[PDB]
Amino acid sequence: ENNAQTTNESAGQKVDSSMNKVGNFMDDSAITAKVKAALVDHDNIKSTDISVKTDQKVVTLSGFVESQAQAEEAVKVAKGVEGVTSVSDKLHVRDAKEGSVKGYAGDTATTSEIKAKLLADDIVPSRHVKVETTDGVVQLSGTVDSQAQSDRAESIAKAVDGVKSVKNDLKTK
């Protein structure tokens, strides 16, 4: 028929504003600006659960870390920025950590490690020679190319803590 069109308004979200510091407070707050950068810079520190805040030239670190080291590094990087006078650690570990681990009662442990040494040797053919321990008695059975490789095998077998005696049964070619 005829022209109708539509009526639509316009909005200016991005306008210019060339202003500066005429009378605003930006001193301690300006210190946190670099601190949050030092926290995110370190992969070892999850700044996601860390709240940084500067109060009277003192940067307070509070939140939840994975381990102690995570927090220890946080306070270091925070104090690494220029402007901060002191850092207050208020971070808390949320995960569990131990200190003294232990194994179990089993002579097989000697065999487990004795093998790791024999195969790591430059002459002891642990690939063809097997070792087993009984009551702390390390026994080596198999075949070697020469006595040089035989002797070495036993040399380490008796060197492993927990062994009471060694029994070289590996034959030579």
UniProtKB/Swiss-Prot annotation:
It comes from the Bacteria. GO terms for biological process: chaperone-mediated protein folding; hyperosmotic response. Residues 27-95, 106-173 form the BON domain. GO terms for cellular component: outer membrane-bounded periplasmic space. The keyword Cell inner membrane does not apply. PANTHER family: BON DOMAIN-CONTAINING PROTEIN. This is Osmotically-inducible protein Y. It comes from Escherichia coli (strain K12).
